[PDB]
Amino acid sequence: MAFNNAVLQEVSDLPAGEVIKASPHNVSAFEVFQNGLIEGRFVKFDAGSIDILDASATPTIAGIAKRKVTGEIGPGVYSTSGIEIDQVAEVINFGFATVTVQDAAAPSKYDPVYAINLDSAEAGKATENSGATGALAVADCVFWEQKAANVWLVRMNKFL
Amino acid sequence: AYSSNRRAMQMRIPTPLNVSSVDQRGFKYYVESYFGVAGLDVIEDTAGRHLTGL
Amino acid sequence: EGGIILARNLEHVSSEIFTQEFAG
């Protein structure tokens, strides 16, 4: 398609997978991960690798996959074995980080963050709704501010 | 309605029409020609607008 | 097998600068 938008009404606000380096932040590199790791979304630590949330029992949410500004242009995706190979999966696991939320989400500040623990394109998306489909609580994480469409900056109190 | 701005629409014709040299197989002349075009490169989805029915 | 031209040379990158435009 020609481009996403000819003219934007207002500057789009801080895409997902971003950590603000003012507050105490920590983004920890994980050497092995899953192909197609959709950045800007909650990623679990399973069998010693970072991977997309799916219908697991109690996934160890390792944080939010960081968005690389100087990565491959395209869908925000961690991809192995290509010209756009990503060697290591930067995962934001402490501080304020932006995460894509569902379209149904209207999460006010300090609501507990829930991630869609489903095996689909909605995997690892934050939400307010504790009763959404495949919603799984994220321990000590709360919504903070509303960034660009469907992207909420959340706060991870402890290390995720 | 469309924007004739360079940054809105371009007409991409990377290679203009080239004609081959004349081929003479005895008394059978033959000329072939080609051109390479990308067509209308619309750069913005909302750089024009349509009215259907008028 | 395939061809002799790797993909990145068959695809051309335009030098023109395209600046994103916002409301006036």
Side-chain angles (χ1 to χ4, degrees):
Chain A
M1 202 85 88
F3 272 113
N4 199 4
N5 290 318
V7 175
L8 266 170
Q9 208 166 7
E10 293 179 353
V11 169
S12 46
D13 189 285
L14 201 65
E18 282 294 350
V19 72
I20 62 170
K21 290 213 195 309
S23 296
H25 66 293
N26 173 77
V27 53
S28 66
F30 286 78
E31 272 297 328
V32 66
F33 55 85
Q34 197 187 13
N35 196 7
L37 190 78
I38 298 169
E39 66 183 1
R41 292 158 66 134
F42 279 121
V43 299
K44 67 171 174 181
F45 186 92
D46 193 70
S49 84
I50 291 295
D51 45 356
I52 313 291
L53 279 172
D54 49 359
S56 173
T58 61
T60 294
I61 311 280
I64 290 155
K66 187 186 171 65
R67 152 177 176 280
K68 307 142 60 81
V69 293
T70 309
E72 48 274 28
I73 285 177
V77 174
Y78 281 111
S79 58
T80 188
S81 76
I83 178 64
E84 68 256 14
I85 190 167
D86 300 309
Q87 272 316 92
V88 73
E90 287 103 318
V91 173
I92 309 172
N93 63 7
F94 184 58
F96 296 94
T98 47
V99 61
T100 61
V101 310
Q102 298 207 122
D103 284 317
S108 65
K109 191 198 273 268
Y110 273 81
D111 283 88
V113 170
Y114 287 81
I116 322 307
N117 198 26
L118 284 178
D119 187 11
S120 63
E122 288 186 3
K125 267 172 160 180
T127 186
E128 153 185 32
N129 204 321
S130 63
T133 300
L136 168 79
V138 168
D140 267 319
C141 200
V142 298
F143 284 104
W144 200 253
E145 278 203 354
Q146 202 270 330
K147 307 302 189 169
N150 304 297
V151 170
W152 268 80
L153 186 151
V154 311
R155 187 180 78 178
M156 313 184 240
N157 311 345
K158 65 173 74 168
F159 273 87
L160 269 294
Chain B
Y2 63 84
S3 165
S4 69
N5 202 266
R6 179 204 269 283
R7 294 160 31 189
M9 305 173 150
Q10 312 218 59
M11 188 50 186
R12 296 208 190 281
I13 290 148
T15 60
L17 183 148
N18 290 318
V19 289
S20 52
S21 184
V22 298
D23 182 25
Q24 190 204 350
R25 177 179 166 75
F27 298 127
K28 299 301 202 44
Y29 285 88
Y30 171 94
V31 176
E32 203 174 352
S33 179
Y34 75 101
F35 57 87
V37 308
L40 184 77
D41 192 8
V42 175
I43 295 155
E44 287 82 3
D45 193 327
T46 45
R49 212 206 173 75
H50 290 329
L51 182 60
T52 74
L54 185 149
Chain C
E1 170 58 276
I4 62 170
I5 299 284
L6 72 165
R8 63 176 290 161
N9 291 116
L10 282 177
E11 313 162 313
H12 179 72
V13 170
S14 169
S15 160
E16 289 292 328
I17 280 157
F18 284 57
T19 50
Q20 165 64 274
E21 290 285 6
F22 306 106

